[PDB]
Amino acid sequence: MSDLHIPGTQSTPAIQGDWQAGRLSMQGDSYPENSYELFGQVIDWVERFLADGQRPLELDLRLLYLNTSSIKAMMDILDLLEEAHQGGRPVSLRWHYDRRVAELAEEFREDCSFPFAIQAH
């Protein structure tokens, strides 16, 4: 029932899991030394949110640089969402970026069957 709240740092993104709104938000860069230490709890929170109810989950991402292990961690989250979506769970994602090509976002989008908006600002 609790929210997820990871404060951002120079090398790790700020992450907010809003349980009641069914919103998972992330902002910043992600080049931690140990990405599963940072994202394991996020994967867990998403798993629990999907298991404890039927409400929709929305991801709102404002991620900048992602190192290799962070790319793998996000693919794991997206794969959880995709599995849930194929089961009929409403899932949607917004990927914000500043034009000043979102190539990584487009590659992730090709792996997802739920609405996945790549949005310049």
Side-chain angles (χ1 to χ4, degrees), residues 17-114:
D18 192 323
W19 185 272
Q20 252 183 41
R23 272 189 160 48
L24 178 62
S25 302
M26 313 185 195
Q27 312 90 34
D29 297 297
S30 190
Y31 45 101
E33 51 215 330
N34 193 327
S35 288
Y36 224 68
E37 262 314 282
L38 180 78
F39 286 104
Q41 64 201 323
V42 182
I43 294 171
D44 195 278
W45 188 91
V46 172
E47 275 171 8
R48 295 187 279 108
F49 182 90
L50 299 171
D52 306 351
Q54 263 309 132
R55 284 181 300 118
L57 182 56
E58 280 216 311
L59 263 68
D60 196 83
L61 303 182
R62 301 178 145 92
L63 297 168
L64 308 173
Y65 184 70
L66 294 193
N67 68 353
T68 288
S69 63
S70 289
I71 289 173
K72 298 187 170 267
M74 300 283 322
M75 181 80 66
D76 288 344
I77 292 169
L78 295 182
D79 279 329
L80 258 288
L81 299 175
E82 170 75 0
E83 179 51 39
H85 179 245
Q86 301 296 109
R89 191 65 171 261
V91 175
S92 61
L93 184 149
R94 279 170 299 282
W95 188 296
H96 306 275
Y97 76 108
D98 195 315
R99 272 188 301 239
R100 307 173 303 181
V101 195
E103 202 53 78
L104 177 70
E106 304 278 8
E107 288 159 355
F108 282 147
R109 180 165 182 255
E110 294 172 283
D111 306 328
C112 301
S113 79
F114 47 86

